[PDB]
Amino acid sequence: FNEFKTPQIDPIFDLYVAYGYVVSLIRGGAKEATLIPHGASYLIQTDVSNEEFRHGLVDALSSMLSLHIALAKLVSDADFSAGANINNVYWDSVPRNLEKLMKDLEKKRSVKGTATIPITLMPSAGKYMLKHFGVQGGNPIKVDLLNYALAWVGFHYYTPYIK
RNA sequence: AUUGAAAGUUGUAGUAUGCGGUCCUUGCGGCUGAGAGCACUUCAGGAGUUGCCCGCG
Numbered sequence: 001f002n003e004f005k006t007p008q009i010d011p012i013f014d015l016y017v018a019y020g021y022v023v024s025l026i027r028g029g030a031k032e033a034t035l036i037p038h039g040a041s042y043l044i045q046t047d048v049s050n051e052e053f054r055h056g057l058v059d060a061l062s063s064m065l066s067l068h069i070a071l072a073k074l075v076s077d078a079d080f081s082a083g084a085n086i087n088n089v090y091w092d093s094v095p096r097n098l099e100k101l102m103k104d105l106e107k108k109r110s111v112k113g114t115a116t117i118p119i120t121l122m123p124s125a126g127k128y129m130l131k132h133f134g135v136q137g138g139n140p141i142k143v144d145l146l147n148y149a150l151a152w153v154g155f156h157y158y159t160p161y162i163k
Numbered sequence: 164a165u166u167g168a169a170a171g172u173u174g175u176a177g178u179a180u181g182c183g184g185u186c187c188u189u190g191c192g193g194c195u196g197a198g199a200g201c202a203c204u205u206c207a208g209g210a211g212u213u214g215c216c217c218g219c220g
Contacts, residue, residue: 130166 002046004053007147011040013122017147018042020154028056057146058105060153061098068095080156083163084120094118094152101149111145121151 006018018035021044025033030048037043068076075082075091080098082091097115104111116139117125128135 132166133168 016151024057028052
């Protein structure tokens with residue numbers, strides 16, 4: 001069993017990533033899988049290796065980008081583009097991140113950077129953070145590119161939202 | 164003196180204004196508590212009895 005571990009950041013963001021795990025898995029197969037919750041970790045047990053996981057994830061994000069291009073720096077009225085991205089700059093930021101994740105992904109190459117998580121995928125985050133007696137410039141909270149993209153896929157494929 | 168320390172989810176706001184439970188209406192007309200009827204029939208205030216007794220204008 002893969003029993004792939006899931007990073008502990010936020011039981012809302014952690015839910016999104018560990019729960020888009022399954023949608024990335026189903027498109028590549030990975031039968032007889034289960035999701036054990038640990039309060040916030042949300043570990044997953046599966047008999048899958050990494051390559052089928054990656055093929056499923058890239059298939060999901062390929063459908064995602066195909067849906068994105070259907071409407072239009074391209075801004076589409078999609079859940080992951082403008083339906084849930086409350087910020088105007090994220091309307092363009094998210095699709096570019098998704099396509100960069102793809103371009104890194106079909107060539108069998110792991111990611112090498114990190115990206116800022118909007119408040120949409122986790123309301124616990126934000127712009128600032130109180131360190132001792134004040135805040136930091138910019139956004140202290142950042143997440144891995146693959147986790148960010150896969151949490152976006154999980155949010156777009158499962159969780160309902162109304163505008 | 165606890166990642167706690169400072170902090171109104173705050174101030175102002177009428178469901179309010181005019182709107183008939185209203186106009187017409189017999190508890191109405193006819194009706195014998197009436198006809199027959201002995202307080203009637205028998206009946207003694209009744210039976211006894213010295214104004215009594217004496218008398219010179």
